[PDB]
Design a protein around this ligand. Sequence first.
Ligand SMILES: CO[C@H]1CC[C@]2(CC1)Cc1ccc(-c3cncc(C)c3)cc1[C@@]21COC(N)=N1
Length: 368
Amino acid sequence: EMVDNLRGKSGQGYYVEMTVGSPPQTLNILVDTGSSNFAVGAAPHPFLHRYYQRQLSSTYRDLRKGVYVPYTQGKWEGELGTDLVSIPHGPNVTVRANIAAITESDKFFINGSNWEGILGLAYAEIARPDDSLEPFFDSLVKQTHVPNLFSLQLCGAVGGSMIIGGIDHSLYTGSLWYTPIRREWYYEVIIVRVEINGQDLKMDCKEYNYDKSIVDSGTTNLRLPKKVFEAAVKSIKAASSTEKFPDGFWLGEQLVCWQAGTTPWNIFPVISLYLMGEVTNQSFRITILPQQYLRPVEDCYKFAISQSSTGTVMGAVIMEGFYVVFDRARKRIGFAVSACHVHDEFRTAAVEGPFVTLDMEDCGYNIP
Ligand SMILES: CO[C@H]1CC[C@]2(CC1)Cc1ccc(-c3cncc(C)c3)cc1[C@@]21COC(N)=N1
């Protein structure tokens, strides 16, 4: 009933259908594990298919508070209020949630996209304008019997599933391996080892998490810290030396093209991230393929691994390989091989363990 409740377009994210107010107003809302506000278009911005009309809802309540949100890539400004919210292809429930009515924005909405809002699924600490503004999932858990858990199956070329309040076993193969949530703000995790085609980058594990590592469905790329990215590109270049590519390509400043149906996947290496496990000195590894990190542009592809100054971001390139369980009740994140992941006859995405790794806690970054 919740299976295939996500739709999308390549590089434009994944959205779920939601209803807001009384009578219900249907809206397509972007699923974002890297933010914590429920913010919807509330004015006729030309890129919008539809928007939330507060004057048409008898259950709308004004909080009489503004919210101004600049961010690296843009800005949004809204008016805070509460209303009745439901997910038609989710649990049979209605909650009173905080809604930020977007009244002004810049580089927020996408020209040609089918979503009109963002559902922030992370914790209160990162909510705007402060942690006193209760996020949607927290409201859903407080007002209903829905278990404090959700899982995501993002399927690359788009569709997928958001299982609210549970795990659907048919969406994954093999076993789920759990990594602890380091702190409840973003979905912060610890990377203890990085391998390119089984070859360790041999870096101080603190570099992998400088200044944080997060699981973010609202990001397309696998974002790596500058020093880690340099070492990863150097190794990927070496493993794929059988072909040449301008530098701009590895920088995402230009595209690479092959004649159709002939892309040389085997020349490209596998990428492995070892994550902190449940028990002391134990890790597991997640492995992704060039099918995840080479993103088709509509056979032309973009290198979807990029430099970052905000730490590791496990975006859509990571998540598309895997069934991801956001186990909020147990403060952990589960990973299992996705039954919908894109692969070939030679290599498959993998979740393997246990491994023995020492000093895993030394890998977290802490402000001096
Ligand atoms: C509280 O205000 C926050 C500020 C930051 C944004 C969310 C709301 C704003 C925003 C707008 C669009 C997209 C997006 C565009 N295209 C494709 C994808 C997949 C997503 C992502 C985001 C952000 C920025 O990063 C994350 N994770 N969400």
